[PDB]
């Protein structure tokens, strides 16, 4: 019963570029409420960067409106973050999340030369 | 076939009719053709897909009906939607959900009192303005708001014999956001029909009157069922 | 007259691990009076990690002691630093410096996988 989410993508980019990350899940993603994509920094909590409903509306916070993007894919159960345009704050360690409690392994994501 | 096609995206319209008369369609025909070997047809055009999407989350007696018939006829089980569970949550999952709502401004204090699911699920407005420091109204409105939102998409089966949740559902879906307060008081569907409206309002901290008329008579019809 | 820094070394390790940086300069580094190694982050302003003087007396600041170690090298004129045990946050654009005014033009250090 207990949903296993696994993460995809990650590495190392340059400043400007693209990304995209894959969260894969055991079940069906449309049963599921609403999923959510985290993001930790080192030295620092965690912080939310999207979520998506069952429904399909999407909120994103203010500092990172416009150079990402959520969508979920019904073909394979597989919940996609896309990254247009990258900063070099924006080097963390991604995490998906299910409905709030289950959790993902992580990602390392980081932007130099 | 080809023709089939046709009627697998008719389904996404906004109004009623259209997808009642397409689920009336496909599920007679998938009666038609289920006694006969030929069922891989609904296989190979996907529309098992788009059933077994629509069903979940879905507040329509006639449609959601109609393709629970559709799905069982073919031998398939009917998805159920995959709910949290709120009132088994500590501290962590509060926290994270403040970082999901937006509210993330607060979870310094709502770490410092400790609150979680179950006290998470009980919050009025004056431990809100008092303690936990959300002084303006507007805000206040907002955070109830998100509350609402929650409580009624919510996973009560650890702690809801009688199925409360589903007899509050069948009436108005914005209703079964109230299931929490009827079970930690006490209640159950049994000896439901004989509360007052006076211990509705504090008690099961239903605040609406038009919520309180309405769950009054309908549950005071159902009087002496057993 | 004006002296030239040239610097070398950088690039990318992993969390844990050492770097060398050399600076080269014009002329004999016994001349002059004080050289150093300044850090600037992304996001912040700069700050000092080492400094030597023309007696090789050397200061170092409380963040990186035991971490870091300064030298002169008199044989090819060359100013070396080396950075033994290394964390996350120490990446940022690393300066050589000569005995105030005079600066180089950096290198990126970076640390991840």
């Known amino acids: 019963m207990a949903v296993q989410l696994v993460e995809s993508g990650g590495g190392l980019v340059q400043p400007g570029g693209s990304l995209r990350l894959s969260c894969?899940?055991?079940?069906?993603?449309?049963?599921?409420?609403?999923?959510?994509?985290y993001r930790q920094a080192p030295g620092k909590q965690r912080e939310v960067?999207?979520?998506?409903?069952?429904?399909?509306?999407?909120?994103?916070?203010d500092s990172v409106k416009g150079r990402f993007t959520i969508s979920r894919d019904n073909a394979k159960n597989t919940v996609y973050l896309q990254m247009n345009s990258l900063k070099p704050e924006d080097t963390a360690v991604?995490?998906?999340?299910?409905?709030?409690?289950?959790?993902?392994?992580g990602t390392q994501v980081t932007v130099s030369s | 076939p080809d023709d089939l096609q046709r009627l697998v995206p008719l389904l996404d319209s906004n109004r009623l009719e259209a997808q009642c008369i397409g689920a009336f369609y496909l599920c007679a025909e998938a009666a038609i053709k289920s006694l006969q070997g030929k069922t891989k047809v609904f296989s190979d055009i996907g529309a098992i897909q788009s059933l077994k999407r629509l069903v979940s989350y879905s507040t329509n007696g006639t449609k959601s009906a109609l393709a629970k018939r559709a799905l069982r006829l073919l031998g398939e089980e009917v998805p159920r939607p995959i709910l949290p569970s709120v009132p088994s949550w500590k501290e962590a999952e509060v926290q994270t959900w403040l970082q999901q709502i937006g509210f993330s401004k607060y979870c310094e204090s709502f770490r410092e009192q400790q609150v979680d699911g179950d006290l998470l699920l009980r919050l009025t407005e004056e431990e809100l303005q008092t303690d936990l420091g959300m002084k303006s109204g507007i805000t206040r409105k907002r955070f109830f708001r998100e509350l609402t939102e929650l409580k009624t998409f919510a996973n009560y089966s650890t702690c809801d014999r009688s199925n409360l949740a589903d007899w509050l559902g069948s009436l108005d879906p914005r209703f079964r956001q109230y299931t929490y307060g009827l079970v930690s008081c006490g209640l159950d569907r049994s000896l439901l029909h004989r509360v007052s409206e006076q211990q509705l309002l504090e008690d099961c901290g239903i605040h609406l009157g038009v919520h309180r008329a309405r769950i009054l008579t309908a549950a005071r019809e159902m009087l002496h069922s057993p | 007259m004006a002296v030239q820094l040239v610097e070398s070394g950088g690039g990318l390790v992993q969390p844990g691990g050492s770097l060398r940086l050399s600076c080269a300069a014009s002329?004999?580094?016994?001349?002059?009076?004080?050289m150093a190694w300044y850090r600037q982050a992304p996001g912040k302003q700069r700050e000092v990690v080492a400094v030597?003087?023309?007696?090789?007396?050397?200061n170092y600041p409380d963040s990186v002691k035991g971490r870091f170690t300064i030298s002169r090298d008199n044989a090819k004129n060359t100013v070396y630093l080396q950075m033994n045990s290394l964390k996350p946050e120490d990446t940022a654009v690393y300066y050589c410096?000569?005995?105030?005014?005079?600066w180089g033009q950096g290198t990126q250090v970076t640390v991840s996988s």
């Open positions: 410096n000569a005995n105030v005014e005079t």
């Open positions: 002329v004999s580094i016994s001349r002059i009076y004080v």
């Open positions: 030597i003087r023309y007696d090789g007396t050397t």
